[PDB]
Coordinates of C-alpha atoms and ligand atoms in Angstrom, one line a residue:
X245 CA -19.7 25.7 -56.6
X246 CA -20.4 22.3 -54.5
X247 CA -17.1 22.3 -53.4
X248 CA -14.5 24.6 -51.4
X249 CA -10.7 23.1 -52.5
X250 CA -8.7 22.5 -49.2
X251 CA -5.6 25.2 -49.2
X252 CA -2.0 22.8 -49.4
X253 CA 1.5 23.7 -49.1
X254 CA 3.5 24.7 -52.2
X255 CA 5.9 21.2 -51.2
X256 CA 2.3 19.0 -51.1
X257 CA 1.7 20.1 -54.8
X258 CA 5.0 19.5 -56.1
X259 CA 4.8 16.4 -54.9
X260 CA 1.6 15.6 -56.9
X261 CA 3.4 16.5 -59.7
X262 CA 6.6 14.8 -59.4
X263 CA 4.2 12.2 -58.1
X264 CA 2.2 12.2 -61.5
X265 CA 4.9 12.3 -63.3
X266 CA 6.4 8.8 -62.0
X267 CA 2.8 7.2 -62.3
X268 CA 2.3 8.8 -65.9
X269 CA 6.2 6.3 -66.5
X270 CA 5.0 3.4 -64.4
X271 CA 1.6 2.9 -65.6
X272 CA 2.8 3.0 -69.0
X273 CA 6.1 1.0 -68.9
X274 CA 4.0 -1.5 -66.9
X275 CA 1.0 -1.7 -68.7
X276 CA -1.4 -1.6 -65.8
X277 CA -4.3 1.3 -66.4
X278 CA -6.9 -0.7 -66.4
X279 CA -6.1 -2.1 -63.2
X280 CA -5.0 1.0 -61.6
X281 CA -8.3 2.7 -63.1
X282 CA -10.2 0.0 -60.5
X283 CA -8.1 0.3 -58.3
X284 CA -9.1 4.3 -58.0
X285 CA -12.3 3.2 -58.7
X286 CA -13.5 0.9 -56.0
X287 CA -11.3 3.0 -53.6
X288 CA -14.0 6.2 -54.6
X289 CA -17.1 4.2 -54.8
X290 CA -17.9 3.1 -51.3
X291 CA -18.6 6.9 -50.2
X292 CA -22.9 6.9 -49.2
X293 CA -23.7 10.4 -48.9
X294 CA -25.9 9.2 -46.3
X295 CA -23.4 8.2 -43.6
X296 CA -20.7 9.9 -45.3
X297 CA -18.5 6.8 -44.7
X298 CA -16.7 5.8 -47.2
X299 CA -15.0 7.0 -50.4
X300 CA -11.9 8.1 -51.4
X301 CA -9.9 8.4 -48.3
X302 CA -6.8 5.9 -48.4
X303 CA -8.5 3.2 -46.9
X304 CA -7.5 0.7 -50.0
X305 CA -4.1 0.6 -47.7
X306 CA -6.1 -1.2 -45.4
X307 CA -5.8 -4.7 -45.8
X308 CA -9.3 -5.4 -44.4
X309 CA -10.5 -3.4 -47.5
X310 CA -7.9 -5.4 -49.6
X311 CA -9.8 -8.5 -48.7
X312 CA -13.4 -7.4 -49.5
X313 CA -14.2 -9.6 -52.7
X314 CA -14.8 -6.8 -54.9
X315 CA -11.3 -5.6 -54.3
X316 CA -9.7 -9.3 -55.1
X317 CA -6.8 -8.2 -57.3
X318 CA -6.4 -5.2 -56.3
X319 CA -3.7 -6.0 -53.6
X320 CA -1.0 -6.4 -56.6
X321 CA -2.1 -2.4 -57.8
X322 CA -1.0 -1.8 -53.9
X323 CA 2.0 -3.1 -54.0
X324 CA 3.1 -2.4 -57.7
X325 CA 2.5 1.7 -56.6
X326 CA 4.0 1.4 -53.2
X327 CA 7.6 1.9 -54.3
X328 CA 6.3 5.3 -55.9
X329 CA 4.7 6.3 -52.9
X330 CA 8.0 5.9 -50.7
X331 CA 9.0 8.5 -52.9
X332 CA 6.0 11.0 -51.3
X333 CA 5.9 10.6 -47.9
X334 CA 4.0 13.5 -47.8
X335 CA 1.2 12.7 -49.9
X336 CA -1.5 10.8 -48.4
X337 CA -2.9 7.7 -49.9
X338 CA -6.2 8.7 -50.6
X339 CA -4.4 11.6 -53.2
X340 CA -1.9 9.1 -54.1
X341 CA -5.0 6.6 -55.6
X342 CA -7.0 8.8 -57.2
X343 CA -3.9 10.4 -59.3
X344 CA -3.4 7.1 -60.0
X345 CA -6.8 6.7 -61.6
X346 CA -6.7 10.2 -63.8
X347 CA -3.0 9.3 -64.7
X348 CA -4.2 5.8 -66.4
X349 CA -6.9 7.5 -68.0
X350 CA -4.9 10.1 -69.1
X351 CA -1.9 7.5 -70.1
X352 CA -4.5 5.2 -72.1
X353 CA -5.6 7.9 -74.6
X354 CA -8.6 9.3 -72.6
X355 CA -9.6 13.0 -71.0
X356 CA -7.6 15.0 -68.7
X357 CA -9.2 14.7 -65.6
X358 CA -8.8 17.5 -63.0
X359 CA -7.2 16.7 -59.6
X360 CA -7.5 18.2 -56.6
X361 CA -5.0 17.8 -54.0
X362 CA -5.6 17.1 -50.0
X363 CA -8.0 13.6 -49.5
X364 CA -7.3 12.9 -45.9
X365 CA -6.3 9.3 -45.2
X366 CA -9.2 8.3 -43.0
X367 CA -8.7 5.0 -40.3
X368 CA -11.8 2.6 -40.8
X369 CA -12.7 1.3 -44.0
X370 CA -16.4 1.2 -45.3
X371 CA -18.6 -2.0 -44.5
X372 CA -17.9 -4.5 -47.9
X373 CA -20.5 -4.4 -49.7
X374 CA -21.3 -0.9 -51.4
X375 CA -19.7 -1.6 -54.9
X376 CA -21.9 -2.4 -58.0
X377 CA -22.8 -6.2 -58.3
X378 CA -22.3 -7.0 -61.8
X379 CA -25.3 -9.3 -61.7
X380 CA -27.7 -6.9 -61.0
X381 CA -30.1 -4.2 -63.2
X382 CA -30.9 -0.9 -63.5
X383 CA -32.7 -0.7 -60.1
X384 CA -29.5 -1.8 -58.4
X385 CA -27.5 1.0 -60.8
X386 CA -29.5 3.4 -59.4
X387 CA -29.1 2.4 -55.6
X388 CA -25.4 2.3 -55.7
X389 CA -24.4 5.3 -57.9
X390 CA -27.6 7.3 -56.9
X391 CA -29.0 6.7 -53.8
X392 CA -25.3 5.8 -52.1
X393 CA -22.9 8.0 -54.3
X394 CA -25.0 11.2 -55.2
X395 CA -23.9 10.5 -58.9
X396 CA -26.7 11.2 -62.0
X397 CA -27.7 8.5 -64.4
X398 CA -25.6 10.4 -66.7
X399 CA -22.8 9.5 -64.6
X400 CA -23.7 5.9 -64.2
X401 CA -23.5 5.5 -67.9
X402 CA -20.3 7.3 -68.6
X403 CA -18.6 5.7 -65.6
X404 CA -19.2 2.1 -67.2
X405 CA -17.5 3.4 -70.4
X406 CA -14.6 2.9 -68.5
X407 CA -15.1 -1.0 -69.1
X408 CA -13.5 0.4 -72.4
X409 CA -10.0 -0.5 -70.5
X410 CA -8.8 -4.1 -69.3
X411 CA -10.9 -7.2 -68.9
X412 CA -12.7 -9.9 -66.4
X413 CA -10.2 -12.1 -64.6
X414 CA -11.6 -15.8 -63.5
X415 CA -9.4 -15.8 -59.9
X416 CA -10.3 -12.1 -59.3
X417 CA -14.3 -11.7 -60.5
X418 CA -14.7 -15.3 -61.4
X419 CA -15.8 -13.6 -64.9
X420 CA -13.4 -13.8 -67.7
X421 CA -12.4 -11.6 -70.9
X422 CA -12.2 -8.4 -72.0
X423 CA -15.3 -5.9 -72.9
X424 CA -12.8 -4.4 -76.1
X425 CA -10.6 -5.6 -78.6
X426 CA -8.1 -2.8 -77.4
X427 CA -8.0 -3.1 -73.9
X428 CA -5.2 -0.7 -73.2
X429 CA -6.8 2.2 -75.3
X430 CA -9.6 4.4 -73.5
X431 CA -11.9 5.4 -76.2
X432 CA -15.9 4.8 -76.8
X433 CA -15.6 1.7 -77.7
X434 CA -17.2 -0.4 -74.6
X435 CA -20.7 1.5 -75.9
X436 CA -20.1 0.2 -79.6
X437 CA -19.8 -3.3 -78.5
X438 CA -22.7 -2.9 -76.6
X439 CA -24.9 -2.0 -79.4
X440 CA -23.9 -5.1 -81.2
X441 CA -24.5 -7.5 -79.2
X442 CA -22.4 -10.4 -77.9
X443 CA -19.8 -11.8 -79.9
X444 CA -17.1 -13.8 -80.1
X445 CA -13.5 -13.2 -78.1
X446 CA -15.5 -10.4 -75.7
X447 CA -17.3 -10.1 -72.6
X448 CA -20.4 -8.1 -71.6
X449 CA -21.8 -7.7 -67.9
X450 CA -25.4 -8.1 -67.0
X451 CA -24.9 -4.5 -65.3
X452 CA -23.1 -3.5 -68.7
X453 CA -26.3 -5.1 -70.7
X454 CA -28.6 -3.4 -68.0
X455 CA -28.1 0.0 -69.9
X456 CA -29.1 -1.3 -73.1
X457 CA -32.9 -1.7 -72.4
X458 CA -33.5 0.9 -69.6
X459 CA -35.2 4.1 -71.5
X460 CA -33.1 6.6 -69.3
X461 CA -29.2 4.6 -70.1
X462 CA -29.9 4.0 -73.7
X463 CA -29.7 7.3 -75.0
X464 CA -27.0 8.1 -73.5
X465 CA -25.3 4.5 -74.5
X466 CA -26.4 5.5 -78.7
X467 CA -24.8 8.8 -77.6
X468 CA -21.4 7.6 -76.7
X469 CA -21.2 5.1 -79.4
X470 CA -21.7 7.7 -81.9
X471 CA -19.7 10.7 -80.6
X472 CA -16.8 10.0 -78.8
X473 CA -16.1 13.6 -77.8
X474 CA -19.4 13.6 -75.9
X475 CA -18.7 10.5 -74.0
X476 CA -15.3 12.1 -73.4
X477 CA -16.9 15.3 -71.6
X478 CA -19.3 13.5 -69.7
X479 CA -16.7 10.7 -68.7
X480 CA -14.0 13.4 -67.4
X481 CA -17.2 15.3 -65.2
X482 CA -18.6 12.2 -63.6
X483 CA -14.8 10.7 -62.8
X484 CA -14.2 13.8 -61.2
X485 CA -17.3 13.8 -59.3
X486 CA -16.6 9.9 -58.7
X487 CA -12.8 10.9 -57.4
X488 CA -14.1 13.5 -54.5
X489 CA -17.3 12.2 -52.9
X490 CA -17.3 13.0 -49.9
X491 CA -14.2 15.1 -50.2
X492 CA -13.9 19.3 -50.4
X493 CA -18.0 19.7 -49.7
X494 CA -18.9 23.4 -49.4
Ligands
LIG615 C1 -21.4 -0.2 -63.3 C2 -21.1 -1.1 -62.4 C3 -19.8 -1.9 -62.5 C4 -19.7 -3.2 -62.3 C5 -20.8 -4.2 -61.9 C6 -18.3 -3.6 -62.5 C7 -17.8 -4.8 -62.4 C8 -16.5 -5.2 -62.8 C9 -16.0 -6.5 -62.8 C10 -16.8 -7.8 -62.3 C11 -14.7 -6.5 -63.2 C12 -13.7 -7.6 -63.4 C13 -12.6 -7.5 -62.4 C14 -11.7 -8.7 -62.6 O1 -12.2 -9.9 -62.6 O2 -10.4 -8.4 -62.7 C15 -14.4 -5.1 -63.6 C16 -13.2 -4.7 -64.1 C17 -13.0 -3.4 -64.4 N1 -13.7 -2.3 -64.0 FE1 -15.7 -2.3 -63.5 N2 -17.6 -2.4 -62.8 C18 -18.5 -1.4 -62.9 C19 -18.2 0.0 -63.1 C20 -16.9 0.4 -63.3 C21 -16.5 1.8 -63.2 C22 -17.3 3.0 -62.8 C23 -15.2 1.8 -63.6 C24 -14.2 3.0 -63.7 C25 -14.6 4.2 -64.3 C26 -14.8 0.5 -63.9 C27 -13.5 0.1 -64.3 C28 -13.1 -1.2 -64.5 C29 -11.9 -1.6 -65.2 C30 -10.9 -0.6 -65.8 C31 -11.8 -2.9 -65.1 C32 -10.7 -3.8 -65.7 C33 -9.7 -4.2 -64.6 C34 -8.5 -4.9 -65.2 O3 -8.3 -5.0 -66.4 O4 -7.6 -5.4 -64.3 N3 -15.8 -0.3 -63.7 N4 -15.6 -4.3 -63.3
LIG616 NA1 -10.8 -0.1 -75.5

């Protein structure tokens, strides 16, 4: 009951739907989940429960938020959705991001997240620097998902299965290749890797790697390798979480 939904008109919900609908065609026909799954990602994951700045609120727009170097890339997921959202003037940005993230996990094989309509579109950015750093431990895990995002360790390791789409990019990370030999399907697989070890043709984080020998991740990483309707329950909970921090608090 942490949250109290936000009342919208019968016209802003049929514009999610038409909305989701055109997203659920592009994402496909385009071949971009993975990216559009970051791009609803980093968008969410600047919100610090202790300032309450950040989070999902639009502010990917911004072009100052474009240009943080987490977000290199994401400036082409902008501008590939913007001809969709000329469609729905009435829908703001922050809604129009975070349907874009459930739609490409819906579109790539995954859970159906719920969504919640009415994210304001808020006017400053978060400072740059909130997101995960992919060279960093558990410790570091636990600051930016915990301590900043309110999420549970639970969350932190379901939320990285979702290295289960796309790949590293040299000019955008400066890492390169992809954690899964099917990029464009969102299944367990990230987890399985992980349990093997490195090998040839894929990449693993030292965040991803990080969850392997902490006592609290592991479990949870043998869980999701070995039942992928588990990791499928957890995943659609903490995405949701992820998708309204900050957003509908009772
Ligand atoms: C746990 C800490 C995390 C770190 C350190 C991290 C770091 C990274 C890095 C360095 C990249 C490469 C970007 C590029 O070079 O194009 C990446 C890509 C990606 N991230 Fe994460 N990430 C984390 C968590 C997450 C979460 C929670 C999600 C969503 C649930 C996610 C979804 C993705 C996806 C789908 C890609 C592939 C993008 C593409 O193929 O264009 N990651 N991540
Ligand atoms: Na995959």
């Amino acid at each position: 009951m942490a949250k109290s939904y936000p009342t919208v008109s019968a016209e802003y919900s049929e514009a999610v739907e038409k909305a989701r609908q055109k997203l659920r065609a592009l994402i496909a026909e385009k071949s971009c989940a993975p990216l559009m799954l970051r791009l609803a990602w980093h968008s969410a994951g600047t919100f610090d429960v202790s300032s309450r700045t950040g989070g999902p609120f639009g502010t990917m727009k911004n072009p100052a938020e474009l240009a943080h170097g987490a977000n290199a890339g994401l400036d082409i997921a902008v501008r590939l959705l913007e001809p969709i959202k000329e469609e729905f003037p009435i829908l703001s940005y922050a809604d129009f991001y975070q349907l874009a993230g459930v739609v490409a996990v819906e579109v790539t094989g995954g859970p159906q997240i719920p969504f919640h309509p009415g994210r304001e579109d808020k006017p400053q950015p978060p400072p740059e620097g909130r997101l995960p750093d992919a060279t960093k431990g558990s410790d570091h895990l636990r600051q930016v998902f915990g301590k900043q995002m309110g999420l549970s360790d639970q969350d932190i390791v379901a939320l990285s299965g979702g290295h289960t789409l796309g790949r590293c990019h040299k000019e955008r990370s400066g890492f390169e290749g992809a954690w899964t030999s099917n990029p464009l399907v969102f299944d367990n697989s990230y987890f399985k890797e992980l349990l093997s070890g490195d090998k040839e043709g894929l990449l693993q984080l030292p965040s991803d790697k990080a969850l392997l020998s902490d006592p609290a991740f592991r479990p949870l990483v043998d869980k999701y390798a070995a039942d992928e309707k588990a990791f499928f329950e957890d995943y659609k909970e903490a995405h949701l979480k992820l998708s309204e921090l900050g957003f509908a608090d009772a």
